[PDB]
Design a protein around this ligand. Structure first.
Ligand SMILES: OC[C@@H]1O[C@H](O[C@]2(CO[C@]3(CO[C@]4(CO[C@]5(CO)O[C@H](CO)[C@@H](O)[C@@H]5O)O[C@H](CO)[C@@H](O)[C@@H]4O)O[C@H](CO)[C@@H](O)[C@@H]3O)O[C@H](CO)[C@H](O)[C@H]2O)[C@H](O)[C@H](O)[C@@H]1O
Ligand SMILES: [Ca+2]
Ligand SMILES: [Ca+2]
Length: 491
């Protein structure tokens, strides 16, 4: 009758997950009441504290653990293998793995067990994947029009446009009126690393691309990456960068965006930042000084290995597996992922077409897509296959639009035939990689920021590459190359 789940949700959503409409209806459908431990900030740290202290729930919902965490928990018996539960009790999930058997292999550890239940979302394939570019660049076209400027075609054009934004006062002469160039530095949708590809090769959140010769390339020791840093340094020197770029957060970024203070900025979807208007548009791919014109592929995809694990203290495995399988029912997967219908107290993502028993996206009418989604989605394990569109659900309007923009602006310049596959490394290789990344990851962004602020990259570049080798870069690369070769060979 009752299960205790830890979960992760947005701070815009209710403290008690059971106040969400989806979870009220789901309790009626399943007959199971969930008592939630709901962490709405710093989920991973609070989860790790619970595991370390022995305060385990029946299952961790919407978990998102790394592979190294996954295998360590499995080795210590914190979580259990689940392939037998799938086989015995999970017909919805088994049907998905029968329609797309490639996912079975992505769920299976090198020891042959399955330890977690995945998120699956089919939106485009290959270069056309919705994930191929995360930190899209957007520009204020109203300012271009007001100042009599053409859309930049080159990185040199971009400098001149941004200087016009600073010197030409398109939205007022105040010291803080116009922010020519802004970003949230680091990983994710708001970083500036998209532009590094205008110097060839570019960069992504893994700092890892795959050459057309089949050689895995760590991007952050490339001469091309040095030239990218120097370009951003020029913008800094010219007084063109948001003075709080390296300190602000998403809520501040969004507040500045809503006031339309940005000339050029980065985000997944402009509608979350500068709003639903034609004042901002996609910045087309720029040519660099030598004619480099490129879009680096991310290694993102519509799959996450672990959106749920079952702990060793769960005493109702059949009930838990059946609850989880209910999330993989198509109409439930769509709603858990995106929101729901029929709330009279709150805007709805969907309406339910009674006749066809299917879901149809409603217009957002100016509401930010991520804001309403955060309030009403559930997350957790689920599956959305491209066969569902036109049958179970409409394709989201924002998703279709973004797929069209990727195809129009970016795919022609995505010249790497491959990106880096989603591999499942052995526990030994995972722990070697995790020790190297404990040094490398923070160091890479620290130096990048330092160089943008101090201008000393030419003096320090060689020492920096030596430091990366001290931290184990060549071993790191050899391991990534091993698993790439093993993936291509197919074990
Ligand atoms: O790092 C914390 C962790 O991140 C994990 O997921 C998120 C993103 O979750 C969402 C994603 O929502 C979108 C992208 O959604 C898709 C692609 O999957 O893109 C289509 C629209 O173009 C849409 O149909 C597809 O589903 O991202 C933007 C906002 O960035 C949304 O407008 C869009 O829907 O982010 C939303 C807000 O957090 C959440 O409601 C969504 O589920 O990864 C990034 C971080 O790199 C997000 O911060 C994070 O949410 C993980 O799911 C977890 O929940 C934590 O967010
Ligand atoms: Ca000015
Ligand atoms: Ca390299």
């Amino acid at each position: 009758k009752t299960l205790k789940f830890m979960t992760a949700s947005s701070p815009l959503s209710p403290k008690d997950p059971n106040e969400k409409l989806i979870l009220q209806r789901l309790e009626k459908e399943t007959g199971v009441h969930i008592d939630w431990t709901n962490y709405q900030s710093d989920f991973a740290e609070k989860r790790n504290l619970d595991i370390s202290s022995g305060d385990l729930p029946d299952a961790i919902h919407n978990d998102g653990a790394s592979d190294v965490d996954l295998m360590n928990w499995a080795k210590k018996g914190v979580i259990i293998p689940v392939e037998d539960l799938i086989d015995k009790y999970m017909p919805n999930l088994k049907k998905i793995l029968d329609e797309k058997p490639e996912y079975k292999a992505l769920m299976t550890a090198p020891d042959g067990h399955i330890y977690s239940f995945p998120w699956i979302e089919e939106l485009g394939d290959g270069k056309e994947s919705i994930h191929s570019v995360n930190d899209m660049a957007w520009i204020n076209k109203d300012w271009l029009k007001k100042l009599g400027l053409e859309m930049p075609k080159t990185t040199d054009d971009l400098i001149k446009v941004l200087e016009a934004f600073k010197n030409g006062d398109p939205n007022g002469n105040g010291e803080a009126a116009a922010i020519p160039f802004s970003f949230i530095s680091g990983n994710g949708n708001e970083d500036f690393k998209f532009l590094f590809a205008a110097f060839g090769i570019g960069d992504n959140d893994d700092h890892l691309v795959v050459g057309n010769d089949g050689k895995v390339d760590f991007t952050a020791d490339n001469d091309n990456y040095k030239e990218g840093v120097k370009f951003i340094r020029q913008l800094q020197e010219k007084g063109l960068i948001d003075k709080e770029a390296f300190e602000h957060d998403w809520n501040s970024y969004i507040a500045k965006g809503h006031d339309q203070k940005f000339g050029v900025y980065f985000t997944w979807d402009k509608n979350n930042v500068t709003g639903s208007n034609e004042s901002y548009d996609v910045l087309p791919v720029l040519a660099g000084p030598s004619g480099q014109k490129h879009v680096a592929r991310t290694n993102g995809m519509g799959f996450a290995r672990d959106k749920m694990v079952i702990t060793s203290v769960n005493k109702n495995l059949e009930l838990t597996a059946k609850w989880i399988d209910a999330q993989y029912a198509p109409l439930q997967s769509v709603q858990n992922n995106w929101g729901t219908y029929g709330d009279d107290k709150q805007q709805n993502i969907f309406e339910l077409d009674q006749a066809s028993n299917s879901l149809k996206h409603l217009p957002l009418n100016g509401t930010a897509p991520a804001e309403l989604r955060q309030k009403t989605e559930v997350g957790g394990p689920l599956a959305i296959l491209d066969s569902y569109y036109g049958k179970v659900t409409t394709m989201p309007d924002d998703a279709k639009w973004r797929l069209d923009l990727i195809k129009e602006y970016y795919v022609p310049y995505m010249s790497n035939v491959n990106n880096y596959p989603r591999v499942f490394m052995t526990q030994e290789d995972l722990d070697k990689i995790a020790h190297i990344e404990a040094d490398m990851n923070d160091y890479i962004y620290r130096k990048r920021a330092e160089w943008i602020v101090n201008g000393n990259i030419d003096t320090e570049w060689d020492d920096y590459k030596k430091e990366l080798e001290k931290y184990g870069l060549s071993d790191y690369l050899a391991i990534k190359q091993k698993y790439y070769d093993q993936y291509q060979a197919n074990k």
